[PDB]
């Protein structure tokens, strides 16, 4: 069949990310135009919850990446600023980026820069897992490798990134999907980075709950972000626990609005 593999790049989505359709089916995907490991990392993915990979390719200098597109866009867009969003549909989101989040822990991946910019949504409002440009293996034959690089971005950083010289990976991107938590309950972050120089991280480790962010939010999420946003990362909730909470597992919100007719 000829020009099944010509695609033409219609628009700007985010290196540079572009809208890809294809000449002949019409098929949407988005190009990543630059890479070693992060193609590596991206060929170990498959789950309903992580964006898919379907190749590269190389011309030269620039790499080309073939990977999903989203039509929902960023979860970040779906954050009303200062209010955040409905918390059946948080919980709901919270839900799908634990389920990728357990997938990549499973296979020894961890993400390093989960936020709301890298959270992507499908036609069905489904949440897919985006960037592992900065992403490692932190467990390979069944052998755990602490980790000593500073990287992600400030507000979602885990503490003892800022405070240790080593530490584990997992209970670091617990972390992040905590402050992914409040962002899209309170549509606010709570600190700049969680230092003791930091006045909004010093009120949270005293409790001062009557303060923004967490005054938005209600008492059944709050509990389960007190065990998330916990600095001691060995005390720190695991996903396992999370998965038992009592908010995480409330009756909240409605499936998908059916097609239906009366009489
Ligand atoms: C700003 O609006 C959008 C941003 C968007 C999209 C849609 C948007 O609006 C509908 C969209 N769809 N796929 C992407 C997209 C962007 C980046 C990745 C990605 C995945 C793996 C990786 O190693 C590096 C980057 C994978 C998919 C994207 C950005």
Same mark, same amino acid.
């Given at each position: 069949?000829?020009?099944?593999?010509?695609?033409?790049?219609?628009?700007?989505? #985010?290196?540079?990310?572009?809208?890809?359709?294809?000449?002949?089916?019409?098929?949407?995907?988005?190009?990543?135009?630059?890479?070693?490991?992060?193609?590596?990392?991206?060929?170990?993915?498959?789950?309903?919850?992580?964006?898919? &990979?379907?190749?590269?390719?190389?011309?030269?200098?620039?790499? =080309?990446?073939?990977?999903?597109?989203?039509?929902?866009?960023?979860? &970040?867009?779906?954050?009303?600023? %200062?209010?955040?969003?409905?918390?059946?549909?948080?919980?709901?989101?919270?839900?799908?980026?634990?389920?990728?989040?357990?997938?990549?822990?499973?296979? #020894?991946?961890?993400?390093?820069?989960?936020?709301?910019?890298?959270?992507?949504?499908?036609?069905?409002?489904?949440?897919?897992?985006?960037? &592992?440009?900065?992403?490692?293996?932190?467990?390979?034959?069944?052998?755990?490798?602490?980790?000593?690089?500073?990287?992600?971005?400030?507000?979602?950083?885990?503490?003892?990134?800022?405070?240790?010289?080593? &530490?584990?990976?997992?209970?670091? %991107?617990?972390?992040?999907?905590?402050?992914?938590?409040?962002?899209?309950?309170?549509?606010? +972050?709570?600190? %700049?980075?969680?230092?003791?120089?930091?006045?909004? =991280?010093?009120?949270?480790?005293?409790?001062?709950?009557? +303060?923004?962010?967490?005054?938005?939010?209600?008492?059944?999420?709050?509990?389960?972000?007190?065990?998330?946003?916990?600095?001691?990362?060995?005390?720190?909730?695991?996903?396992?626990?999370?998965?038992?909470?009592?908010?995480?597992?409330?009756?909240?919100?409605?499936?998908?609005?059916?097609?239906?007719?009366?009489?």
């Amino acid at each position: 069949v000829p020009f099944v593999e010509d695609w033409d790049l219609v628009q700007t989505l #985010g290196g540079e990310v572009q809208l890809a359709v294809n000449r002949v089916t019409e098929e949407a995907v988005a190009v990543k135009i630059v890479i070693k490991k992060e193609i590596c990392i991206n060929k170990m993915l498959n789950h309903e919850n992580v964006v898919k &990979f379907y190749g590269h390719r190389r011309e030269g200098n620039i790499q =080309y990446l073939f990977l999903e597109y989203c039509s929902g866009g960023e979860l &970040f867009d779906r954050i009303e600023p %200062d209010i955040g969003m409905p918390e059946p549909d948080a919980q709901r989101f919270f839900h799908q980026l634990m389920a990728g989040v357990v997938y990549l822990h499973g296979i #020894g991946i961890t993400h390093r820069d989960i936020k709301p910019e890298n959270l992507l949504l499908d036609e069905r409002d489904n949440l897919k897992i985006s960037d &592992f440009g900065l992403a490692t293996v932190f467990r390979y034959n069944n052998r755990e490798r602490l980790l000593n690089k500073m990287c992600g971005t400030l507000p979602y950083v885990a503490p003892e990134l800022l405070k240790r010289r080593e &530490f584990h990976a997992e209970p670091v %991107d617990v972390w992040s999907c905590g402050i992914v938590l409040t962002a899209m309950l309170a549509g606010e +972050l709570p600190w %700049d980075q969680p230092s003791d120089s930091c006045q909004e =991280y010093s009120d949270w480790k005293e409790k001062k709950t009557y +303060l923004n962010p967490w005054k938005k939010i209600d008492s059944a999420p709050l509990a389960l972000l007190h065990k998330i946003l916990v600095e001691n990362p060995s005390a720190r909730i695991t996903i396992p626990d999370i998965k038992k909470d009592r908010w995480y597992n409330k009756p909240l919100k409605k499936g998908a609005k059916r097609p239906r007719v009366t009489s």
